[PDB]
Amino acid sequence: MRLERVLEEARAKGYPIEDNGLGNLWVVLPRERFKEEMAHYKAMGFNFLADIVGLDYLTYPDPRPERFAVVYELVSLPGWKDGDGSRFFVRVYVPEEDPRLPTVTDLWGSANFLEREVYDLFGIVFEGHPDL
Numbered sequence: 001m002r003l004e005r006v007l008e009e010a011r012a013k014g015y016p017i018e019d020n021g022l023g024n025l026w027v028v029l030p031r032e033r034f035k036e037e038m039a040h041y042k043a044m045g046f047n048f049l050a051d052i053v054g055l056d057y058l059t060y061p062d063p064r065p066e067r068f069a070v071v072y073e074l075v076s077l078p079g080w081k082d083g084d085g086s087r088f089f090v091r092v093y094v095p096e097e098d099p100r101l102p103t104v105t106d107l108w109g110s111a112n113f114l115e116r117e118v119y120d121l122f123g124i125v126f127e128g129h130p131d132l
Contacts, residue, residue, distance in 0.1 A: 002086040025088045034092050035102035046074040049108035054118040068094035103129040
């Protein structure tokens with residue numbers, strides 16, 4: 001299955017794995033792996049970016065590595081070539097001193113609007129994504 005190939009790789013590369021209960025899976029990606037791993041996910045078959053959700057952790061009780069984190073939802077849509085129907089989540093923490101992330105508009109067209117709504121709400125600049 002396309003899912004296990006992402007988790008088996010997640011352990012192999014050292015990414016944290018959250019198991020919200022369950023069938024929904026989180027893959028925490030450092031900013032250094034983000035741009036390449038996302039394109040790798042598209043190459044693996046995750047041809048649909050369902051949702052991008054930002055997060056401000058300043059009010060939640062327990063702390064996070066950084067204040068900001070941006071959540072990505074990847075789907076391998078039903079249909080062909082061999083759309084498995086797979087779905088998982090990609091989280092990457094963003095430091096509030098350097099609130100920048102690589103864009104994925106060159107990977108999924110739905111990112112242009114999704115990355116814009118996160119920018120307007122949280123001020124997290126996505127480089128390459130055109131603004132002005």
